[PDB]
């Protein structure tokens, strides 16, 4: 029996309670030969039957339809959602265990494939990073914070930088190039900003959600089965005398059972007429292609046929709930006689029984400290702007240099955030654009004089030189911290979900570059001081030095460390400057030169003044206003000395940076739009 296109269609369309684009799954059925349906999962322990038959019973469609079906076997996800007390060692061995149950419990695995999120994140770490990156850097803090009921989390201002498993998340389907989502009607939400996803990076093919239903819990109350309630399902380890004893008590409303509107977050809600024991039948026992219940002689065709012998009491409860107890037995006991018989099985079984040794609530929760540095070492991150001022620029210079005089055998390290800078969205969002300015600003800034004991370093080098460990420590510090916390940082607002992964990243490549001391400009703000509160007050703060070179208007007009002859020209031609005046931006610009360089010299010529020169800032004040000191005589100094001082810089922009400087000006050609 070769299916032709519509048997397939039907087929496949069947597993799914809703199919977000009938249209798009009908085209994927005609034109394409593997699909891949993908679905995944935090091996979180004792595997319910939802999991166990019902999953197995959809696979085996899609697989059926002409589908390959890959798992995620989310290993990360589930320790990123606490799941198993934070061990992550041998969630492997439970990962292990839901697998082997699969084959006992009848998936067809031909075409069925296991990939684990540990293995293959770490070997694509600059693949699949960057796009997590990405997504979160196009997306809004509050649509991320609503992608909270995927984890079975509520939105409630409580949640733990869990703002990253979505972008994770809604990065596999990617990743893994799933042409269908085939998993539970809770993730809705995350499968939804991947169509969004599409629209923006311009893939043209959304990927299809194909969201199958959530099984009712077997009490009155619960519309999913719960964990701190074994009796709300059957779980694939139960003896028959518990799958007697707990379907017996389930509650069983004479209703006929019709389909509940779909909700947007797809999670589900409780009916007191929702009959989870005719739920267990529609999709343990009917959903399987050539089943169908027998009570007392009768044989019931469709599911359909069942319910209203039911509802019309021609079948008694008690018969109904026989039928289902005999019924689900028969579903488990093949699982069962495996684990029983196969040596290596029931070790991995056992295996999971001394896990399941006393429990969490809580002795359990398991996360990371760190270690504390042999000696100093300060580190300080290069602002990502297209245009530095060169106030900052001498800031940061200073810094340096008392930090290593006051700590003589330490260290100090400028990092250029590649990464974290287009997480945030800083400039023009793009990574080419971006890097270029980091590594133009920054070779400037040496040419400006910064010392050559500074280590210069990129956030790709420190990670993709130490991938894992990074990516590790990012994900605990994140468990730690509430996202509300985070958030603070940014003066309790962010702009995009990029900016709290940036956060996060700064206070990981802190500890792995072994810090003691984070040194802060201005365009820093309070992000660097995460780093401090996450070390238990442990590293120092320290602020750079600035406001000393203003603005040039009276109360772009302000000195950027790339600017070249035509700019340093012409800026300093608008600056203010009034006759007779002592107080100006021309002044403050003059007396910080003359601090710098331990006495200013006018060059005039005789008669027309004369030359002078001035040591001290009060002797200058004097001779602007009540003095013979014109505008132009002290103007002339100023722009000779500001470029003579950046000469060597200058240089590198039309010879080694050009290169570079080029597509810097594209970028600012964006930003004008
Ligand atoms: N969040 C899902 C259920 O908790 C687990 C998961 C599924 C698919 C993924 O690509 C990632 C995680």
New binding site residues.
């Given amino acids: 029996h070769h299916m032709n296109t519509d048997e397939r269609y039907k087929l496949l369309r069947s597993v799914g309670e809703e199919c977000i684009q009938e249209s798009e799954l009908r085209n994927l059925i005609e034109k394409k030969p593997l699909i891949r349906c993908?679905?995944?999962?935090?091996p979180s322990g004792r595997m319910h039957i939802a999991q166990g038959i019902f999953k197995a019973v959809n696979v085996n469609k899609c697989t059926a339809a002409g589908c390959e079906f890959v798992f995620?076997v989310?290993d990360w996800?589930a320790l990123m959602?606490d799941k198993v007390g934070g061990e992550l060692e041998k969630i492997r061995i439970v990962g292990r265990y839901l697998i082997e149950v699969w084959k006992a419990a009848g998936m067809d695995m031909d075409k069925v494939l296991f990939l684990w999120?540990s293995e293959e994140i770490t070997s694509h770490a600059d693949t699949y990073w960057r796009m997590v990156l990405d997504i979160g850097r196009q997306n809004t803090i509050a649509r991320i914070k609503k992608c909270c009921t995927?984890?079975?989390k509520t939105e409630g201002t409580l949640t733990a930088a869990q703002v990253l498993?979505p972008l994770?998340?809604c990065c596999?389907?990617f990743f893994?190039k799933a042409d269908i989502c085939q998993?539970?009607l809770?993730?809705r939400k995350?499968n939804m900003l991947a169509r969004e996803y599409c629209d923006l990076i311009g893939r043209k093919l959304k990927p299809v959600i194909l969201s199958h239903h959530m099984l009712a819990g077997l009490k009155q109350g619960q519309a999913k089965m719960s964990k701190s309630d074994p009796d709300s399902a059957i779980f694939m380890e139960d003896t028959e005398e518990d799958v007697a004893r707990k379907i017996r008590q389930a509650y069983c409303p004479r209703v006929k059972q019709s389909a509940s509107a779909i909700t947007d977050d797809g999670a589900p809600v409780a009916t007191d007429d929702r009959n989870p024991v005719l739920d267990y039948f529609q999709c343990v026992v009917y959903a399987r292609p050539g089943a169908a219940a027998t009570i007392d002689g009768t044989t019931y065709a469709t599911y359909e046929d069942l319910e209203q012998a039911f509802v019309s009491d021609e079948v008694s409860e008690d018969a109904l709930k026989s039928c289902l107890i005999d019924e689900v037995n028969a579903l488990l006991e093949p699982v069962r006689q495996h684990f029983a018989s196969n040596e290596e099985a029931h070790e991995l079984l056992e295996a999971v029984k001394s896990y399941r040794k006393d429990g969490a609530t809580l002795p359990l929760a398991e996360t990371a400290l760190p270690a504390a540095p042999a000696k100093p070492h300060a580190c300080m991150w290069m602002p990502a702007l297209l245009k530095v001022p060169l106030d900052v620029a001498e800031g940061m210079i200073k810094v340096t240099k008392d930090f290593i005089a006051a700590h003589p055998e330490g260290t100090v390290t400028l990092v250029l955030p590649d990464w974290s800078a287009v997480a945030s969205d800083e400039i023009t969002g793009v990574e080419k654009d971006i890097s270029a300015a980091l590594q133009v600003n920054c070779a400037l800034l040496k040419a400006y004089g910064l010392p050559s004991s500074v280590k210069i370093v990129t956030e790709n080098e420190v990670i993709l030189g130490n991938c894992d460990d990074f990516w590790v420590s990012v994900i605990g510090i994140a468990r730690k911290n509430l996202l509300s916390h985070v958030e603070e940082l940014y003066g309790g607002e962010v702009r995009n979900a990029g900016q709290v992964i940036a956060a996060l990243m700064r206070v990981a490549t802190a500890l792995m570059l072994s810090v003691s001391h984070v040194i802060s400009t201005s365009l820093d703000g309070h992000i660097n001081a995460f780093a401090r509160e996450y070390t238990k007050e442990r590293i120092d703060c320290v602020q750079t030095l600035e406001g000393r070179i203003p603005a040039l208007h009276r109360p772009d007009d302000v000195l950027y460390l790339d600017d070249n002859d035509m700019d340093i020209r012409r800026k300093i031609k608008k600056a203010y400057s009034a006759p007779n005046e002592e107080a100006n931006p021309v002044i403050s610009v003059a007396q910080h030169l003359l601090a710098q360089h331990g006495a200013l010299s006018i060059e005039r010529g005789e008669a027309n003044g004369g030359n002078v020169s001035y040591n001290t800032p009060e002797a200058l004040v004097a001779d602007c206003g009540s003095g013979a000191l014109h505008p132009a005589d002290l103007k002339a100094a100023v722009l000779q000395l500001l470029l003579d001082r950046s000469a060597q810089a200058r240089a590198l922009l039309n010879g080694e940076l050009k290169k570079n400087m080029t597509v810097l000006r594209n970028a600012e050609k964006k930003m004008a739009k």
């Fill in positions: 993908y679905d995944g999962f935090e995620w989310a996800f959602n999120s995927i984890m079975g498993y994770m998340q596999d389907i893994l998993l539970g809770d993730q995350v």
